[PDB]
């Protein structure tokens, strides 16, 4: 076997557990339709957001 | 404007757990001894 | 794509700038002044569950 060299695990200590995501995000409202990630990997930052 | 709208949670505390069940009184109410045979035979 | 050609051929140019000390100084209302708000940014918070 591959084991699970490969993955995570983090095991459960009860069934059907979950997940959270923290996600940074400017345009006043957190939650909104077009919403953008302040760090978001593939897109960069509005370089002109805090300034001009 | 981050608010506790944006806010997810994990789960709930349960505070308290409840069983209903009934009181039961026979204890004050029947006088009684064990048997200690398949059959019992008391005398008047 | 027309973006891109615009901005490879040296017709548009990526820049980033900072602010005026008179803008920032005053901005939200500061000696009777307005209409200047500052940019404003938060974060989210969500969740993925997992059946087992």
Redesign the interface.
Request: aromatic residues 10%; hydrophobic residues 20%.
């Given at each position: 076997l591959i084991a699970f060299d490969i993955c995570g695990v983090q095991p459960m200590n009860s069934p059907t557990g979950?997940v959270?995501a923290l996600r940074a995000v400017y345009g006043?409202?957190?939650?909104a339709a077009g919403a953008k990630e302040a760090f978001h990997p593939m897109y960069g930052p509005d370089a002109m957001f805090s300034g001009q | 404007?981050?608010t506790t709208?944006?806010?997810?949670i994990?789960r709930p505390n349960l505070v308290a757990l409840t069983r209903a069940t009934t009181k039961l009184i026979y204890s004050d109410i029947v006088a009684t001894q064990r048997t200690n045979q398949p059959v019992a035979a008391f005398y008047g | 794509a027309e973006i891109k050609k615009q901005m490879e051929a040296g017709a548009l140019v990526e820049i980033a700038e900072g602010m005026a000390t008179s803008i920032a100084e005053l901005q939200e209302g500061f000696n009777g002044s307005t209409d200047n708000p500052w940019n404003?940014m938060?974060?989210?918070?969500?969740?993925q569950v997992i059946e087992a």
């Open positions: 979950q959270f006043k409202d957190p939650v | 404007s981050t709208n944006s806010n997810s994990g | 404003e938060g974060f989210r918070i969500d969740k």
